[PDB]
Write a protein that binds this ligand. Structure first.
Ligand code: NA
Ligand code: NA
Length: 91
DNA sequence: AATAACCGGAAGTGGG
DNA sequence: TCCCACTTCCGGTTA
């Protein structure tokens, strides 16, 4: 099953949910969620995963924070903004 | 207060 | 057995 960071990177590449997520500076790997439309993207993540409960942005971001230590995704000090690692961007 | 973004410990679920 | 990669729940902080 796909990993959350890859789900997000794939969305950014495909542009299929452009109103929910977008690059801030794609060269740096920085991206930002929509305040008003992030839940639709979270819902899609849960359905793609086959999870028992409805996925929420709160729970999705709880998972995102766990990447801080290993480094795949880090929180940026900007509203709803995160950053992929160079390794994630390359791989 | 109402709303929103952000936080993480702890325990549960999946598939190795 | 016991870690993976989250998920779910809860209580919380800051603006
Ligand atoms: Na929020
Ligand atoms: Na603010």
């Amino acid at each position: 099953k796909i990993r959350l960071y890859q789900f997000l990177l794939d969305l950014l590449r495909s542009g299929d949910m452009k109103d929910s997520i977008w690059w801030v500076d794609k060269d740096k790997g920085t991206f930002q969620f929509s305040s008003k439309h992030k839940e639709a993207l979270a819902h899609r993540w849960g359905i793609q995963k086959g999870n028992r409960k409805k996925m929420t942005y709160e729970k999705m971001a709880r998972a995102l924070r766990n990447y801080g230590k290993t480094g795949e995704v880090k929180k940026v000090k900007k509203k709803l903004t995160y950053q992929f690692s160079g390794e994630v961007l390359g791989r």
